[PDB]
């Protein structure tokens, strides 16, 4: 049995401006099987209210989620994805940079 | 294999419910029930598409059904009524666009009334003399006749087993009275054996004809005999002279 | 206008914690339709599928699909039998055509058994190829089948084509229009001895975007870092290509997107 | 997902062939079928066409035009046998399955020596009836407009131990004094 290991991508929706409002996008892509688990997590602290695109399907067989937020960065506010898969043997954190 | 349904016949009261049954042994996720009608193409009641669904067809009106196995696929009549005197056809299809597997039907009739349900008389007509001498062949001839609803299986019996060749039989009964709408019916049907065959007087000739009427059941406050489910036959001999 | 797509997957999981069974088609990016075996209905997924398919779409397709889930159980349970697979396993589908930009047609049909390749589909051939001795096993079966074959072939050239015709149409607003990238490049000591060039795009749709850096306007450079294109979140999406270089050559940005090509000289 | 068209009956003489088509207009397809229907039984697949062309079966074989919205089901060396309905039907983009009518198919026994006759049985109790038989396929059969008078189709038998066909038709009447010669003209 192959199974795949998610890339994860953190990234706003505009360029970043401390203090105007934006979008915080963690892209989930190119994993298998389809059973994955998602946050955003604000200087560690999951964030509640939090969307996502339905599963998507790629050609490969491989999956894609998008988890989002409507978010105001600052300089002090450190912004990362934390994700488990049956693939992780711990969860993996990805921090947003810039 | 193939598909089951059952009954093959069957006689209602106006307001009477009754299930038609149909099993497969064929893992068809498809089933369907149709109705054909004199000039028309089959037209669908319900169907399902697979255990645990159903929905209407096109003439769903006054039918049910339940698809809780595979195997089987019901057709609930809710209230008989007239107009639902039809030939009704179970299908299955291993998916939305195989071929369907058909049962072998349900002739069913709706009456007002189960005091217009009268079983055959049947007579055997002999082979004529004029025919054997100027043939040397001999035509047999049965009649069914006053029989209602249309529901018979006429048979041949030479000396006791059912015979097919030489055999002639009317592909639908035919009104007595065609004006009427619930008109008893006469059906015929030829047997030609040879003349040799007809003059040995050891052959036995038997027309059988099953009908379909009322159960052992259903009420019958009525003079003549319950006009039940029964095999009405005539014969003849053969003869030397 | 550019290629389009009409693309349907189906996901069987036995033993889920998940759904059985998960339908979604595609026009292009853009999921369309979704059923899965907890809702047990065929919904849009887009806001002009709903508007231009009457009641009795909805209803049918979510009839064929409760078909479509029992065959793949079926199936799924099967695979693990031929595989002497226990505990959870995944089949998958894809089905699709593309309606080329010179008005020429793809058709395909594949199958996966735990994220591989099992089973494709050649239309051309009426042929499918087999991986292993399990696949090799369906594929007798399925070629058996000359009915099924010439039905697949129908579907992927005709319906499929027609289908994806008709969804364009409903879609249009939305799949033939462009969002124009705005691009912008800059200059960043990134990190203790790296100068880099970034050539970033935002705000584009369809998402096919090229982008490369280019040294004295001849030659395409050999060490470029790409930045996947991802979905910003609005319908439109983002991508950047970065190079190093010497702090003190003219180094350019070209851009392809829509029919629309873009130099951005430092 | 609208229409389909064949012929309510075609008459054909046993040995020769018969073409039935099947015309049907639809905005979406997922192929065509000919089903065969005998006198009192369920339908039977015969033929599937989805691809322009001639798909040959034995003595069958079933034509399709997409582009014409035009099916044929070609039937060879006729027997008695084919004798049944035959029904077009053809599945839309949604997979509804559309019936036509159907097409009755008679076939008529090459009668070698027509011996035209009519005879008159007696019931083994005893009444009788009356047979016409043994006359050439091209002979018409008048279904009576007396009203005590009853009489049949054509119908085919076959003495399968002497290779010999005969087409016949009763009648019987009610009245007392009624005449064979009544009877059939
Ligand atoms: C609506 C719908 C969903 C799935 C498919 C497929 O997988 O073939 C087709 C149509």
Same mark, same amino acid.
């Given at each position: 049995?192959?199974?795949?290991?998610?890339?994860?991508?953190?990234?706003?929706?505009?360029?970043?401006?401390?203090?105007?409002?934006?979008?915080?996008?963690?892209?989930?892509?190119?994993?298998?099987?389809?059973?994955?688990?998602?946050?955003?997590?604000?200087?560690?602290?999951?964030?509640?209210?939090?969307?996502?695109?339905?599963?998507?399907?790629?050609?490969?067989?491989?999956?894609?989620?998008?988890?989002?937020?409507?978010?105001?960065?600052?300089?002090?506010?450190?912004?990362?994805?934390?994700?488990?898969?049956?693939?992780?043997?711990?969860?993996?954190?990805?921090?947003?940079?810039? | 294999?193939?598909?089951?349904?059952?009954?093959?016949?069957?006689?209602?009261?106006?307001?009477?419910?009754?299930?038609?049954?149909?099993?497969?042994?064929?893992?068809?996720?498809?089933?369907?029930?149709?109705?054909?009608?004199?000039?028309?193409?089959?037209?669908?009641?319900?169907?399902?598409?697979?255990?645990?669904?159903?929905?209407?067809?096109? $003439?769903?009106?006054?039918?049910?059904?339940?698809?809780?196995?595979?195997?089987?696929?019901?057709?609930?009549?809710?209230?008989?009524?007239?107009?639902?005197?039809? $030939?009704?056809?179970?299908?299955?299809?291993?998916?939305?666009?195989?071929?369907?597997?058909?049962?072998?039907?349900?002739?069913?009739?709706?009456?007002?009334?189960?005091?217009?349900?009268?079983?055959?008389?049947?007579?055997?007509?002999?082979?004529?003399?004029?025919?054997?001498?100027?043939?040397?062949?001999?035509?047999?001839?049965?009649?069914?006749?006053?029989?209602?609803?249309?529901?018979?299986?006429?048979?041949?019996?030479?000396?006791?087993?059912?015979?097919?060749?030489?055999?002639?039989?009317?592909?639908?009964?035919?009104?007595?009275?065609?004006?009427?709408?619930?008109?008893?019916?006469?059906?015929?049907?030829?047997?030609?054996?040879?003349?040799?065959?007809?003059?040995?007087?050891?052959?036995?000739?038997?027309?059988?004809?099953?009908?379909?009427?009322?159960?052992?059941?259903?009420?019958?406050?009525?003079?003549?005999?319950?006009?039940?489910?029964?095999?009405?036959?005539?014969?003849?001999?053969?003869?030397?002279? | 206008?550019?290629?389009?797509?009409?693309?349907?997957?189906?996901?069987?999981?036995?033993?889920?914690?998940?759904?059985?069974?998960?339908?979604?088609?595609?026009?292009?990016?853009?999921?369309?339709?979704?059923?899965?075996?907890?809702?047990?209905?065929?919904?849009?997924?887009?806001?002009?599928?709903?508007?231009?398919?009457?009641?009795?779409?909805?209803?049918?397709?979510?009839?064929?699909?409760?078909?479509?889930?029992?065959?793949?159980?079926?199936?799924?349970?099967?695979?693990?039998?031929?595989?002497?697979?226990?505990?959870?396993?995944?089949?998958?589908?894809?089905?699709?055509?593309?309606?080329?930009?010179?008005?020429?047609?793809?058709?395909?049909?594949?199958?996966?058994?735990?994220?591989?390749?099992?089973?494709?589909?050649?239309?051309?051939?009426?042929?499918?190829?087999?991986?292993?001795?399990?696949?090799?096993?369906?594929?007798?079966?399925?070629?058996?089948?000359?009915?099924?074959?010439?039905?697949?072939?129908?579907?992927?050239?005709?319906?499929?084509?027609?289908?994806?015709?008709?969804?364009?149409?409903?879609?249009?607003?939305?799949?033939?229009?462009?969002?124009?990238?705005?691009?912008?490049?800059?200059?960043?000591?990134?990190?203790?001895?790296?100068?880099?060039?970034?050539?970033?795009?935002?705000?584009?749709?369809?998402?096919?975007?090229?982008?490369?850096?280019?040294?004295?306007?001849?030659?395409?450079?050999?060490?470029?870092?790409?930045?996947?294109?991802?979905?910003?979140?609005?319908?439109?999406?983002?991508?950047?290509?970065?190079?190093?270089?010497?702090?003190?050559?003219?180094?350019?940005?070209?851009?392809?997107?829509?029919?629309?090509?873009?130099?951005?000289?430092? | 997902?609208?229409?389909?068209?064949?012929?309510?009956?075609?008459?054909?003489?046993?040995?020769?062939?018969?073409?039935?088509?099947?015309?049907?207009?639809?905005?979406?397809?997922?192929?065509?079928?000919?089903?065969?229907?005998?006198?009192?039984?369920?339908?039977?697949?015969?033929?599937?066409?989805?691809?322009?062309?001639?798909?040959?079966?034995?003595?069958?074989?079933?034509?399709?035009?997409?582009?014409?919205?035009?099916?044929?089901?070609?039937?060879?060396?006729?027997?008695?046998?084919?004798?049944?309905?035959?029904?077009?039907?053809?599945?839309?983009?949604?997979?509804?399955?559309?019936?036509?009518?159907?097409?009755?198919?008679?076939?008529?026994?090459?009668?070698?020596?027509?011996?035209?006759?009519?005879?008159?049985?007696?019931?083994?109790?005893?009444?009788?009836?009356?047979?016409?038989?043994?006359?050439?396929?091209?002979?018409?059969?008048?279904?009576?407009?007396?009203?005590?008078?009853?009489?049949?189709?054509?119908?085919?038998?076959?003495?399968?131990?002497?290779?010999?066909?005969?087409?016949?038709?009763?009648?019987?009447?009610?009245?007392?004094?009624?005449?064979?010669?009544?009877?059939?003209?």
């Amino acid at each position: 049995m192959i199974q795949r290991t998610p890339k994860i991508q953190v990234y706003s929706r505009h360029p970043a401006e401390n203090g105007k409002s934006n979008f915080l996008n963690c892209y989930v892509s190119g994993f298998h099987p389809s059973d994955i688990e998602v946050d955003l997590l604000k200087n560690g602290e999951r964030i509640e209210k939090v969307e996502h695109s339905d599963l998507s399907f790629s050609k490969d067989w491989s999956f894609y989620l998008l988890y989002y937020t409507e978010f105001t960065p600052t300089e002090k506010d450190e912004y990362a994805c934390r994700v488990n898969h049956v693939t992780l043997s711990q969860p993996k954190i990805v921090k947003w940079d810039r | 294999a193939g598909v089951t349904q059952t009954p093959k016949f069957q006689v209602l009261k106006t307001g009477q419910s009754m299930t038609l049954q149909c099993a497969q042994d064929m893992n068809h996720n498809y089933m369907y029930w149709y109705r054909q009608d004199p000039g028309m193409g089959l037209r669908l009641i319900y169907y399902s598409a697979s255990e645990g669904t159903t929905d209407k067809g096109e $003439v769903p009106n006054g039918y049910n059904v339940s698809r809780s196995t595979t195997e089987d696929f019901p057709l609930r009549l809710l209230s008989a009524a007239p107009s639902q005197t039809s $030939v009704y056809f179970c299908a299955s299809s291993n998916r939305e666009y195989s071929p369907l597997h058909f049962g072998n039907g349900t002739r069913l009739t709706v009456t007002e009334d189960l005091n217009k349900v009268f079983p055959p008389e049947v007579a055997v007509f002999e082979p004529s003399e004029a025919e054997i001498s100027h043939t040397q062949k001999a035509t047999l001839v049965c009649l069914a006749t006053g029989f209602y609803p249309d529901h018979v299986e006429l048979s041949w019996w030479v000396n006791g087993k059912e015979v097919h060749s030489g055999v002639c039989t009317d592909p639908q009964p035919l009104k007595e009275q065609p004006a009427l709408n619930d008109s008893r019916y006469a059906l015929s049907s030829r047997l030609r054996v040879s003349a040799t065959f007809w003059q040995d007087p050891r052959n036995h000739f038997r027309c059988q004809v099953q009908f379909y009427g009322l159960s052992e059941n259903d009420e019958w406050t009525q003079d003549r005999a319950k006009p039940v489910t029964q095999i009405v036959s005539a014969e003849a001999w053969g003869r030397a002279d | 206008m550019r290629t389009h797509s009409l693309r349907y997957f189906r996901l069987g999981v036995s033993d889920p914690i998940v759904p059985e069974f998960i339908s979604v088609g595609y026009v292009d990016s853009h999921p369309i339709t979704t059923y899965d075996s907890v809702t047990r209905q065929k919904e849009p997924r887009a806001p002009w599928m709903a508007e231009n398919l009457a009641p009795d779409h909805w209803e049918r397709y979510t009839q064929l699909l409760r078909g479509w889930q029992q065959m793949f159980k079926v199936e799924l349970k099967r695979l693990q039998r031929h595989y002497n697979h226990s505990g959870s396993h995944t089949y998958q589908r894809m089905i699709g055509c593309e309606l080329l930009e010179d008005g020429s047609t793809t058709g395909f049909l594949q199958y996966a058994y735990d994220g591989q390749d099992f089973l494709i589909f050649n239309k051309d051939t009426l042929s499918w190829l087999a991986v292993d001795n399990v696949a090799h096993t369906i594929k007798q079966a399925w070629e058996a089948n000359q009915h099924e074959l010439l039905y697949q072939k129908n579907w992927l050239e005709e319906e499929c084509i027609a289908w994806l015709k008709r969804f364009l149409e409903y879609g249009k607003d939305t799949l033939q229009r462009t969002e124009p990238p705005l691009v912008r490049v800059n200059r960043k000591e990134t990190f203790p001895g790296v100068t880099a060039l970034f050539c970033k795009a935002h705000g584009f749709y369809p998402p096919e975007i090229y982008m490369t850096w280019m040294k004295n306007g001849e030659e395409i450079v050999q060490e470029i870092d790409y930045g996947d294109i991802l979905p910003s979140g609005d319908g439109t999406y983002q991508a950047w290509a970065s190079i190093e270089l010497d702090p003190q050559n003219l180094y350019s940005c070209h851009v392809e997107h829509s029919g629309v090509h873009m130099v951005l000289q430092v | 997902g609208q229409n389909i068209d064949q012929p309510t009956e075609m008459t054909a003489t046993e040995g020769a062939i018969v073409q039935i088509n099947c015309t049907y207009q639809t905005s979406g397809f997922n192929g065509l079928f000919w089903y065969q229907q005998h006198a009192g039984e369920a339908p039977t697949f015969l033929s599937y066409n989805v691809l322009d062309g001639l798909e040959e079966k034995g003595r069958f074989s079933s034509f399709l035009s997409r582009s014409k919205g035009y099916s044929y089901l070609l039937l060879k060396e006729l027997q008695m046998k084919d004798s049944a309905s035959y029904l077009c039907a053809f599945l839309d983009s949604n997979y509804q399955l559309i019936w036509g009518a159907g097409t009755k198919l008679i076939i008529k026994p090459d009668i070698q020596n027509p011996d035209p006759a009519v005879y008159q049985l007696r019931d083994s109790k005893s009444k009788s009836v009356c047979l016409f038989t043994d006359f050439d396929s091209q002979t018409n059969v008048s279904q009576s407009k007396d009203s005590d008078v009853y009489i049949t189709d054509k119908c085919v038998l076959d003495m399968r131990s002497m290779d010999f066909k005969s087409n016949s038709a009763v009648a019987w009447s009610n009245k007392s004094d009624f005449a064979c010669a009544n009877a059939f003209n």
